[PDB]
Design a protein around this ligand. Structure first.
Ligand SMILES: Nc1ncnc2c1ncn2[C@@H]1O[C@H](COP(=O)(O)OP(=O)(O)O)[C@@H](O)[C@H]1O
Ligand SMILES: [Mg+2]
Ligand SMILES: [Mg+2]
Length: 246
C-alpha cells in the first residue's frame, strides 16, 4: 500500500551519494521531493529505475511490501513501477500510436489488439484533453525535450502504472513542459496510484498540489511538510532551509 525508500545508502565510484534516504509515498497520494541540486534527488530517481552504474550499500526500496532493488527495470515495471519505454530519437517513420502499442505490449507481456489499444488510448486522450490526430505524428519529429515529456505522459496514462517517479528538474521553469506533466499526474490521481514528483523549483507544485513535500540535502531527507514547505523554500531559498534544520 506504499512505495517506501528505507535507510537507502548508495554510491558510485566509492563516493557515497545517498546517505540514508527515508521516504514513504502512500498509494493514493502524490508527493514532491525537492533539493538544491547535487543533494541526490535525481540519483534517487535513477536508483529507483535500476541504473546499474550505482551500488546500493544499505537499505531497501519496497513497493507494496516487496523489496525491488534486486529486480531488473523490466521486473520492477511488472510490479507496477512506471518505466517509460526508450527508443532511439533518430529513428524515423514511427507513429506515436505504433510506439505506444509497442510499449503497452512490452509491459503487459502479450499482444494487444486494436480495440484494447484504442480504447485505452482514447480514455487517455479524454483525460488529457488531446486530439486523436496527435497519435498520427511521428515519434521524435521535432527532437525536443518538450515532445519527449508529452509522449511519456501519454505512456503514463496508457500503461497505468501503480507508482510513478517523475523527475522534472530538467524542465526548469519551462511552463508548458511542467503543465503537461501536471495534467498527466492529476489525471492519474486515485486510490490505486501514488507518485513522487522530483523538482528543484516549486513551480510545478502550483499545478500538481502535493500531499507531502520531502527536501533532500547532503544525500538524505532533512525536512518534510505540506505544500507550504515548498512555498517557503521557493521564497527564501535552499540556503535558508539548510540552516533552519540545524
Ligand atoms: N558518474 C558519477 N560519478 C561520481 N559521482 C557522481 C556521478 N554522477 C553524480 N555524482 C555525484 O552525485 C551528486 C548528486 O547527483 P544528482 O542526483 O544528479 O543531484 P540532484 O538531482 O539532487 O541535483 C553529484 O553532485 C556528484 O557529486
Ligand atoms: Mg538535489
Ligand atoms: Mg537534479
Amino acid at each position: 500500500s506504499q512505495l517506501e525508500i528505507r535507510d537507502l545508502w548508495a554510491s558510485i565510484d566509492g563516493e557515497t551519494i545517498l546517505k540514508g534516504v527515508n521516504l514513504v509515498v502512500p498509494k493514493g497520494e502524490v508527493h514532491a521531493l525537492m533539493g538544491p541540486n547535487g543533494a541526490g534527488k535525481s540519483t534517487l530517481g535513477k536508483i529507483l529505475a535500476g541504473d546499474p552504474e550505482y551500488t546500493v550499500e544499505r537499505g531497501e526500496i519496497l513497493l507494496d511490501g516487496e523489496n525491488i532493488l534486486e529486480l531488473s527495470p523490466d521486473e520492477r515495471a511488472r510490479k507496477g513501477l512506471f518505466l517509460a519505454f526508450q527508443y532511439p530519437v533518430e529513428v524515423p517513420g514511427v507513429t506515436i500510436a505504433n510506439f505506444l502499442r509497442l510499449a503497452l505490449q512490452a509491459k503487459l507481456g502479450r499482444e494487444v489488439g486494436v480495440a484494447e489499444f484504442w480504447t485505452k488510448v482514447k480514455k487517455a486522450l479524454e483525460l488529457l484533453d488531446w486530439d486523436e490526430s496527435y497519435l498520427s505524428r511521428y515519434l521524435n519529429e521535432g527532437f525536443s525535450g518538450g515532445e519527449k515529456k508529452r509522449n511519456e505522459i501519454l505512456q503514463l496514462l496508457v500503461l497505468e502504472p501503480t507508482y510513478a517517479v517523475l523527475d522534472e528538474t530538467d524542465s526548469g521553469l519551462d511552463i508548458d513542459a511542467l503543465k503537461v506533466v501536471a495534467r498527466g499526474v492529476n489525471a492519474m490521481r486515485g486510490p490505486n496510484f501514488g507518485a513522487l514528483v522530483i523538482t528543484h523549483y516549486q513551480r510545478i507544485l502550483n499545478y500538481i498540489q502535493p500531499d507531502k513535500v520531502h527536501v533532500m540535502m547532503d544525500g538524505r531527507v532533512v525536512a518534510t511538510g505540506g505544500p507550504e514547505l515548498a512555498l517557503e523554500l521557493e521564497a527564501k531559498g535552499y540556503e535558508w532551509l539548510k540552516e533552519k534544520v540545524k
